[PDB]
Amino acid sequence: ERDCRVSSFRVKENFDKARFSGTWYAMAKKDPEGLFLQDNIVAEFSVDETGQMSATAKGRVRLLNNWDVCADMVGTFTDTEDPAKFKMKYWGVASFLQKGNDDHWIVDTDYDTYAVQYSCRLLNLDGTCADSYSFVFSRDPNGLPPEAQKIVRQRQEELCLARQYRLIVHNGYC
């Protein structure tokens, strides 16, 4: 009875790019098909004077046949009419790293503690997502406080993803 249509999902009201800038540690991830970032995932958000948001990310990614590499990624965000919904062009500093262009939604944040991100790469014909991913970010790499954890869990359920996350470990691999 829950609505899982992507078009129904609420996102962060009056999203403030400047307040969102700085270091975000991925605490949990819902993987898309053909997952890329594995763990040790840390993102750095910036906004420039024209108000355009960009980011970098580092994380371990496992090329198949189990080659471990620390990916260094770059992302640039094109605004839409919703201040919390973006198009993210991304690529690796190395040519061979994955590149592409994903929807990037800030579903919720309080700027100084937690953030919930969401991307639907491909819709189902009923408006639900066929291929999604989602990061939960923390300002503190040791994790969220209980109050924020509980808010995030609610947001995870609203995205119809709450059963599908895994924890992201940080152990200095990069």
Ligand SMILES: CCCCCCCCCCCC(=O)O
């Ligand atoms: C968001 C700043 C980092 C640039 C985005 C690189 C992440 C793109 C791949 C995310 C999907 C995945 O990790 O499986």
Ligand SMILES: [Cl-]
């Ligand atoms: Cl709980």
Ligand SMILES: [Cl-]
């Ligand atoms: Cl669950």
